[PDB]
Structure 1
Amino acid sequence: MGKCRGLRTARKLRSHRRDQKWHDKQYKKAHLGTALKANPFGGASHAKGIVLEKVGVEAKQPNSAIRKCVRVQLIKNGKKITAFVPNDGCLNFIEENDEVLVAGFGRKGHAVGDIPGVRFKVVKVANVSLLALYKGKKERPR
C-alpha cells in the first residue's frame, strides 16, 4: 500500500502524487504548455496557410498508393507543414500559392493511417470547402 497511512501524512501523500503526475503524458503536456511552444497550430484547433507545393506521398506498407498532400506555410507563424488533401481528385482543387484551412487528423497530433509524417488535413480553399467543391455545391471561385 506503498504509501504512509498516518493521520498527519497529508503533505507526503499530496506531494508524492504531485511528483508522479508527471509521468502522465497528457498532464505533462499541459503543464509544460507544449501546445503553445512546439506545436505548429497554436494551441488552436484550425490554422490557415499558403500552399507551397503539391506532394505525392508514398503510403506505408503494406498499403500502396500516392497520397496527395500540399505543403503549407502557416500565416500565423510562418511554420511549414504538410497537410493531406482528402477525397477523389480533390488535389485538383488546390493550386500553388492557394491559401487553405487546415485541421488536425483527430489523432491527438499523431499521423493517420498509411499516410506517413502528415498530421493535418485541408478543409477549405476558395475559402471554400473541399466538400462543397467536390460535390459541386459551390465552385473554385475566381
Structure 2
Amino acid sequence: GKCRGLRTARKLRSHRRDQKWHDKQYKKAHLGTALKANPFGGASHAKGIVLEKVGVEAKQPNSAIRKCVRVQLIKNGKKITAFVPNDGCLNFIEENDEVLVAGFGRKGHAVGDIPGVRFKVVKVANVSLLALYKGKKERPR
C-alpha cells in the first residue's frame, strides 16, 4: 500500500474497490454486459437446431477446412458456429437436428486454428458424438 495510516481503512478499501474495475477478469464477471452478450446466457451447455453445415478456413499457418455447424439455439434463438470435434463426424449431422453444444475450453474465446468459433458439438439428437464415433451407439432413424 501507499497510505499506512492507522485510520486509513476507508481510503485503503474504497481505493481497492475503484481499481478492481481495471482488472479484466473481475469487470467481465461483475458487469451484466458479458453475461447478457453470452449466447449460452451463463450456462455450461445449450441445445440448438442445426440449420446449415459450414466449412471454416483454419486461421492460417496450418491450412485445413474445419467442419463446423451454424446452430440456432432454443433458449435465445441466437446463431452460433459450433465445431464438430472428431474426424469425419459431420456425416453424423443432418439439417434440422437438435445438437447439445458446449464451450471449446477458453471460456468464450476462439481456440487455435478456427477463427470466430467458441463452441463444440457434444450430442446429436440425444446421442453422444463419441458413441457415434467409436460405434457403441447407432443414430436413431
- Bin for the TM-score computed over the shorter chain: over 0.9
1:50 touches 1:97 (CA, 8 Å); kept in 2? Answer: yes
Give 1:72 deviation, angstroms: 0.3
TM-align CA RMSD: 1.0
Aligned to 1:107: 106
**Structure 1 stretch displaced more, 35-44 or 7-16:** 35-44
Partner of 1:68, secondary structure, is strand
| Mapped contact 1:35–1:42 kept (Cα < 8 A) | no
Offset from partner CA, 1:62-87 (integer Å, 9 cap, x none)? 01111001000000000001100011
Per the alignment, in what secondary structure is the counterpart of residue 36 of structure 1? helix
Q: Which runs of 4+ in 1 moved over 6 A?
A: none
Identity of aligned residues (%): 100
Q: Distance in 2 between matches of 1:63 and 1:30?
A: 34
* Alpha-carbon distance in structure 2 between the residues aligned to 1:133 and 1:122: 13
Partner Cα separation in structure 2 for residue 47 and residue 78 of structure 1: 11
Output one character per residue of 1:17-53: Cα deviation in whole Å (capped at 9) or x when no partner: 0010011111111210344311001101000100010
Shift of 1:56: 0.7
Counterparts of 2:115 and 2:21, CA distance in 1: 29
Determine the C-alpha separation between the residues in 2 that align with 1:136 and 1:43: 33
Cα distance in 2 for residues equivalent to 1:35 and 1:131:
31
Q: Secondary structure at the match of 1:57?
A: strand
Measured after TM superposition, the shift of residue 3 of structure 1 is: 1.8
TM-score w.r.t. length of structure 2: 0.96
Q: Secondary structure at the match of 1:88?
A: coil
Structure 1 unaligned regions, length at least 5: none
Q: Is the 8 A contact 1:35 1:43 kept in 2?
A: no
Flag the structure with higher strand content: 2
Q: Which residue of 2 aligns with 1:24?
A: 23
